Amino acid sequence: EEKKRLHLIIADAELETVPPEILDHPAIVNYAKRRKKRPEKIILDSTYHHAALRQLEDGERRGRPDIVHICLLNALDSILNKEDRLRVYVHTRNDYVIYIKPETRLPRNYNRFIGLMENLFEKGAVPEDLELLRMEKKTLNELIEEINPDVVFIMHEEGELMIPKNFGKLLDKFKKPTVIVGGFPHGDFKSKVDGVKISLYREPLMAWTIVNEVIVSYEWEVIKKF
Amino acid sequence: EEKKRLHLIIADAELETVPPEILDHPAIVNYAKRRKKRPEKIILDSTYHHAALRQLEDGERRGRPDIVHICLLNALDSILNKEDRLRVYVHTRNDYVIYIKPETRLPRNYNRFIGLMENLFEKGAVPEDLELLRMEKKTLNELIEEINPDVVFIMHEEGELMIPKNFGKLLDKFKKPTVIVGGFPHGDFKSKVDGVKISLYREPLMAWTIVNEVIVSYEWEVIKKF
Ligand SMILES: CSC[C@H]1O[C@@H](n2cnc3c(N)ncnc32)[C@H](O)[C@@H]1O
Ligand SMILES: CSC[C@H]1O[C@@H](n2cnc3c(N)ncnc32)[C@H](O)[C@@H]1O
Ligand SMILES: [Cl-]
Ligand SMILES: [Cl-]
Structure with a gap:
């Protein structure tokens, strides 16, 4: 070594997992239910979650x-x-x-x-x-x-x-x-x-x-x- | 040039798209419905469709x-x-x-x-x-x-x-x-x-x-x- x-x-x-600021943003609650998984456990994916990044800090590159x-x-x-x-x-x-x-x-x-x-x-x-x-x-x-x-x-x-x-x-x-x-x-x-x-x-x-x-x-x- | x-x-x-031989194999009919897309239009993905490749020719590497x-x-x-x-x-x-x-x-x-x-x-x-x-x-x-x-x-x-x-x-x-x-x-x-x-x-x-x-x-x- x-x-x-x-x-x-x-x-x-x-x-990162879904940011706490957006855990109850619509596109997140519906993704989450659809996958039957708790939204905080899910990895943030801008491909699916783009409408929820708009107001997030640095949202464009997250x-x-x-x-x-x-x-x-x-x-x-x-x-x-x-x-x-x-x-x-x-x-x-x-x-x-x-x-x-x-x-x-x-x-x-x-x-x-x-x-x-x-x-x-x-x-x-x-x-x-x-x-x-x-x-x-x-x-x-x-x-x-x-x-x-x-x-x-x-x-x-x-x-x-x-x-x-x-x-x-x-x-x-x-x-x-x-x-x-x-x-x-x-x-x-x-x-x-x-x-x-x-x-x-x-x-x-x-x-x-x-x-x-x-x-x-x-x-x-x-x-x-x- | x-x-x-x-x-x-x-x-x-x-x-390739879902092989014709398996278009009505269970795991394919349910994936397909879940995505609300016609199964023949879907790209074969062994990660999701593994239980339907078992009997396919060359199924293991498809x-x-x-x-x-x-x-x-x-x-x-x-x-x-x-x-x-x-x-x-x-x-x-x-x-x-x-x-x-x-x-x-x-x-x-x-x-x-x-x-x-x-x-x-x-x-x-x-x-x-x-x-x-x-x-x-x-x-x-x-x-x-x-x-x-x-x-x-x-x-x-x-x-x-x-x-x-x-x-x-x-x-x-x-x-x-x-x-x-x-x-x-x-x-x-x-x-x-x-x-x-x-x-x-x-x-x-x-x-x-x-x-x-x-x-x-x-x-x-x-x-x-x-
Ligand atoms: C922002 S692109 C992702 C990363 O790629 C690297 N990178 C991108 N373009 C170059 C380049 N031309 N030369 C060296 N590193 C680069 C940098 O480390 C950057 O943070
Ligand atoms: C089966 S792995 C996918 C492809 O990678 C290439 N490949 C894999 N290992 C090597 C190697 N050691 N040297 C050269 N090509 C390789 C071959 O073109 C092969 O079809
Ligand atoms: Cl050395
Ligand atoms: Cl040249």
């Missing part, structure tokens, strides 16, 4: 757990992941963190992933024994303190521009590099922490594209048989 | 349109895609092909993607004018004939092993390389066509991982500013 590994954090992620799903499928199925060179974390917009054991097999299917997140939020850890997924209250800085990396990079379209190849080379110079990607569809980080801002392209990309650029460029430096 | 572009085909994809969703999000949001160096196609297990205009913005959300596929299957082309998506009856060989590539690679765990970096270099030697990835969760291709079998790793990976390895390795050779 002192070999070189990438520590990847999907941060300020739009992954309830996007699809971003997390696709980022996690990309990361957990990576060659980098199978070679024991990745640790991945989710930090949510409400300052909770989800820890993920490397061997975790996320549902490929979005609605099963949703099901699984509802369980994780309810019980704090899934499954009961393994705690392959484990959630707790935590800020981004508190998480970074635990990881105790030797460098922190923050992926930002407006940071120092790098060729992805070259960013992979750069990450391979550290022992315990941490890379942070926003889990939100647009705008800026909410959680300002210390680190180097890196752009991989001079237009905005989606989080999972960035996850891929970083993971694949790092594989080719760090996996010795490559 | 005679610059170097990758032509990527997700093939024998498990993307109704996996999530694989296509995640492969297409990876491909269409790629840097390679934004640089006009990618054309992507879906070939389904029933010998239909979906053509995709580069500028297409797939729903990030799985259930909207499903919605969109139901429309595409019904009308043959979406939206009415743009035909950003367009479907028609076609075998894999018929599709390859149209593309008229100068080389065809078939991604196979048991093919000639290559370092992804090196496979990118290889693809960059051709004008119009075609790469084929299976859109099925396990097993072999159904559609045997002529081409070079390439493994990128000596264990089985998921289609979207392979899509990423290929697309990212090609970007770094073919985009000159990289």
Whole structure:
């Protein structure tokens, strides 16, 4: 566990249960009944709940757990992941963190992933024994303190521009590099922490594209048989 | 349109409406009513319809349109895609092909993607004018004939092993390389066509991982500013 590994954090992620402010908003009471589930237990999904986000703070960019799903499928199925060179974390917009054991097999299917997140939020850890997924209250800085990396990079379209190849080379110079990607569809980080801002392209990309650029460029430096 | 572009085909994809053999299987009649939609119009989804696949031919690996969703999000949001160096196609297990205009913005959300596929299957082309998506009856060989590539690679765990970096270099030697990835969760291709079998790793990976390895390795050779 002192070999070189990438520590990847999907941060300020739009992954949360229905906000308390809107639990009795019409579109929420009817979704909830239709699914025969208590509205507070349900994961906010902007696709279904769009008419209830209008007056919510930051409503336009909330309830996007699809971003997390696709980022996690990309990361957990990576060659980098199978070679024991990745640790991945989710930090949510409400300052909770989800820890993920490397061997975790996320549902490929979005609605099963949703099901699984509802369980994780309810019980704090899934499954009961393994705690392959484990959630707790935590800020981004508190998480970074635990990881105790030797460098922190923050992926930002407006940071120092790098060729992805070259960013992979750069990450391979550290022992315990941490890379942070926003889990939100647009705008800026909410959680300002210390680190180097890196752009991989001079237009905005989606989080999972960035996850891929970083993971694949790092594989080719760090996996010795490559 | 005679610059170097990758032509990527997700093939024998498990993307189809409910099979005629099971349209009046219980789990299908009740799903269908619950959604107030005619069962033949609905996309087969093994997550919901698992009890109806038991006796279907190949039932175990059918109704996996999530694989296509995640492969297409990876491909269409790629840097390679934004640089006009990618054309992507879906070939389904029933010998239909979906053509995709580069500028297409797939729903990030799985259930909207499903919605969109139901429309595409019904009308043959979406939206009415743009035909950003367009479907028609076609075998894999018929599709390859149209593309008229100068080389065809078939991604196979048991093919000639290559370092992804090196496979990118290889693809960059051709004008119009075609790469084929299976859109099925396990097993072999159904559609045997002529081409070079390439493994990128000596264990089985998921289609979207392979899509990423290929697309990212090609970007770094073919985009000159990289
Ligand atoms: C708002 S898009 C989601 C996240 O993707 C990352 N991102 C988006 N575009 C780029 C880019 N061009 N370079 C680097 N990171 C990016 C950032 O970490 C952002 O929070
Ligand atoms: C059955 S997994 C889906 C598809 O992924 C591709 N694939 C899976 N594992 C590998 C691998 N190790 N190397 C190359 N292609 C692979 C093949 O094209 C397959 O049809
Ligand atoms: Cl090492
Ligand atoms: Cl060119």
